[PDB]
Scaffold this active site. Structure first.
Site, PDB file in Angstrom:
ATOM      1  N   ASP A 148      -3.272  -1.988  -1.440  1.00 56.30           N
ATOM      2  CA  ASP A 148      -4.134  -2.827  -2.231  1.00 56.30           C
ATOM      3  C   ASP A 148      -5.592  -2.349  -1.999  1.00 56.30           C
ATOM      4  O   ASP A 148      -5.854  -1.640  -1.027  1.00 56.30           O
ATOM      5  CB  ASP A 148      -3.963  -4.263  -1.769  1.00 56.30           C
TER       6      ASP A 148
ATOM      7  N   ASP B 134      -9.202  -4.293  -2.868  1.00 57.69           N
ATOM      8  CA  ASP B 134     -10.148  -5.344  -2.488  1.00 57.69           C
ATOM      9  C   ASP B 134      -9.570  -6.252  -1.416  1.00 57.69           C
ATOM     10  O   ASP B 134      -8.409  -6.668  -1.480  1.00 57.69           O
ATOM     11  CB  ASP B 134     -10.525  -6.155  -3.726  1.00 57.69           C
TER      12      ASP B 134
ATOM     13  N   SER C   9      -3.763  -1.888  -7.645  1.00 55.15           N
ATOM     14  CA  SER C   9      -4.777  -2.865  -7.960  1.00 55.15           C
ATOM     15  C   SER C   9      -4.360  -3.678  -9.207  1.00 55.15           C
ATOM     16  O   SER C   9      -3.973  -3.118 -10.236  1.00 55.15           O
ATOM     17  CB  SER C   9      -6.088  -2.125  -8.240  1.00 55.15           C
ATOM     18  N   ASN C  10      -4.480  -5.000  -9.096  1.00 56.76           N
ATOM     19  CA  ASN C  10      -4.304  -5.924 -10.222  1.00 56.76           C
ATOM     20  C   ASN C  10      -5.536  -5.984 -11.126  1.00 56.76           C
ATOM     21  O   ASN C  10      -5.581  -6.793 -12.060  1.00 56.76           O
ATOM     22  CB  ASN C  10      -3.935  -7.341  -9.726  1.00 56.76           C
ATOM     23  N   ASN C  11      -6.529  -5.132 -10.846  1.00 61.51           N
ATOM     24  CA  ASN C  11      -7.760  -5.064 -11.630  1.00 61.51           C
ATOM     25  C   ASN C  11      -7.485  -4.633 -13.056  1.00 61.51           C
ATOM     26  O   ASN C  11      -6.865  -3.609 -13.274  1.00 61.51           O
ATOM     27  CB  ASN C  11      -8.724  -4.066 -11.010  1.00 61.51           C
TER      28      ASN C  11
ATOM     29  N   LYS D 174       1.320  -6.841  -9.461  1.00 62.13           N
ATOM     30  CA  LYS D 174       1.905  -7.448  -8.291  1.00 62.13           C
ATOM     31  C   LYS D 174       1.748  -8.952  -8.408  1.00 62.13           C
ATOM     32  O   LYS D 174       0.726  -9.417  -8.910  1.00 62.13           O
ATOM     33  CB  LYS D 174       1.175  -6.974  -7.033  1.00 62.13           C
TER      34      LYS D 174
ATOM     35  N   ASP E  93      -4.088  -7.858   1.447  1.00 62.13           N
ATOM     36  CA  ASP E  93      -4.674  -9.047   2.032  1.00 62.13           C
ATOM     37  C   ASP E  93      -4.102 -10.400   1.517  1.00 62.13           C
ATOM     38  O   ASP E  93      -4.393 -11.458   2.111  1.00 62.13           O
ATOM     39  CB  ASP E  93      -6.178  -9.017   1.838  1.00 62.13           C
TER      40      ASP E  93
HETATM   41 MG   LIG Z   1      -6.480  -7.570  -2.561  1.00 59.43          MG
END
Ligand SMILES: [Mg+2]
Ligand SMILES: [Mg+2]
Lengths: 290, 290
Positions: free
Chosen positions: A23, A25, A56-58, A207, A232
């Site tokens: 991941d 961030d 990343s879920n960005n 995710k 995280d």
């Molecule tokens: Mg994160």
């Protein structure tokens, strides 16, 4: 079992691993600030011949701009092919799944900014609201939309009236932390609005969805039994890791606290319980040592 | 048991009833059009000495404008005191519950239009975004907000960061039908967004919430065992009726279909099963007959 990862065990876990999924961030960085020792973990992994990939879920930025953050925060020679975002993968799933006739597979109605739209186009998807030569809208995509409005929600539901029109969500992240100490609403909050008004369940890309792993493994072979998943957020990265069959490591630099993880283990909710925890991912470097 | 209400039974049910609670939309009228025979049912009820009261999850209009719709659609001498809306009742609950010190009980952050704001002010509530002499915001109210935006969602969550700040929703109606055949997103869709982003559950005012009945019974004594509840939506009016202990009548002029009600009875979900059904409420007049 939520084991604090150090010593003999750490050396074994990293030694056996063929690769690591990170991941970003809360893991590599927080806001403007890199986790000290994080870039050098990445250097030491390359040097150990262990593959690093990033999940990343960005959906805010297209890959080439998302890649920028790495170098900006001291993460040197990473190639854009190592980075997977819900935006990239949403673009890919829509291409795989758009339900319309070969001659005109369908337009995607998108709730999201300019970055997301670029990815979609980059994959050869027709967008509603792009200039015409209106095309039939065959999917609604809910991404991180900072300009979300009631009017857009109303339009998305009109499209979803046709039950052959797909509902797709990039992720279900409810909210995101900012430097200052405030949160920003997530895509999951906008997906919840669209789901409720339309009476439909979204197809989720990022995710913890198992589809995010399918997206990573189109371009790479990953044996999940030999791969570490580091994040995280228990409900996002840890849950993802479990469903994919990876050894999960919680890092304490981001959203979830150790208390929350220990709660879930006592409740027997094993899918949201990390295999391991480190205070920060700078703690893993020690187990690679020459 | 979902009995079609006619004949001997209808005469008994109405004869024993001391009063009738009517949902409005889908019941008395649809869009521009009154249900034929609906005004004359209301006349015949007054003439039988049976009380009629009206319960609406509408938060779009303040009472005096909501009352207008009655006369406009041929419902004559109804006094505004007979009409209860989620807006009226949200205003009342906030006055009852605002958590702050006596000298400054707190400002309400409102997601809603000008009608709703009027009701709130009419009850003596201080609003965030009204001119200052900023006051501490002690409740977030989510109403039907046609100008809902991401920026507002972000602001509502900032306020909700303080856990002593109330979250209140007028209703959870997911969507609403229009004349043409399209739906408009409901308050429940906006409440779902706010709940998800803030990680909180809203206090719900309107039907099916039992609080809506508490709001009706401040100004009137209602024996629910002798009161009929008539509506078109199983999950709103019928469920309300059950929780309040009223005999429930489904009318088929609105949202729920008889199939949906029969499904729930087979599933044993007795709270969403009407006692009775009429095709339209013009079918009840026959049971009052002189
Ligand atoms: Mg994160
Ligand atoms: Mg109704």
């Amino acid at each position: 079992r939520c084991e604090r990862l150090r010593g003999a065990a750490l050396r074994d876990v990293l030694g056996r691993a063929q690769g690591v999924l990170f991941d970003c961030d809360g893991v590599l960085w927080n806001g403007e600030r890199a986790v000290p020792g994080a870039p050098e973990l990445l250097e030491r992994l390359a040097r150990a011949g262990k593959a690093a990939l990033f999940v990343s879920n960005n959906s805010r930025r297209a890959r080439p701009e998302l890649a920028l953050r790495f170098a900006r925060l001291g993460f040197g020679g990473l190639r854009a092919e190592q980075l997977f975002s819900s935006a990239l993968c949403a673009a890919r799933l829509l291409r795989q799944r758009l339900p319309g006739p070969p001659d005109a597979p369908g337009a995607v109605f998108v709730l999201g900014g300019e970055g997301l739209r670029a990815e979609l186009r980059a994959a050869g998807l027709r967008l509603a609201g792009d200039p015409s030569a209106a095309p039939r809208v065959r999917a609604v995509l809910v991404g991180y939309d900072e300009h979300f409005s009631f009017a857009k929600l109303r339009e998305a539901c009109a499209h979803l009236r046709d039950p052959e029109c797909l509902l797709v969500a990039t992720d279900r992240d409810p909210w995101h932390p900012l430097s200052d100490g405030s949160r920003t609403p997530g895509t999951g909050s906008l997906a919840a609005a669209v789901e409720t008004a339309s009476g439909r369940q979204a197809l989720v890309v990022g995710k913890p969805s198992p589809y995010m792993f399918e997206c990573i493994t189109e371009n790479f072979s990953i044996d999940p039994a030999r791969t570490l998943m580091v994040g995280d957020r228990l409900e996002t990265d840890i849950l993802f890791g479990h469903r994919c069959g990876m050894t999960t490591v919680l890092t304490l630099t981001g959203v979830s606290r150790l208390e929350e993880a220990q709660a879930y283990l006592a409740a027997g909710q094993h899918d949201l319980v990390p295999h391991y925890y480190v205070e920060s991912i700078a703690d893993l470097t020690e187990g690679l040592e020459d």
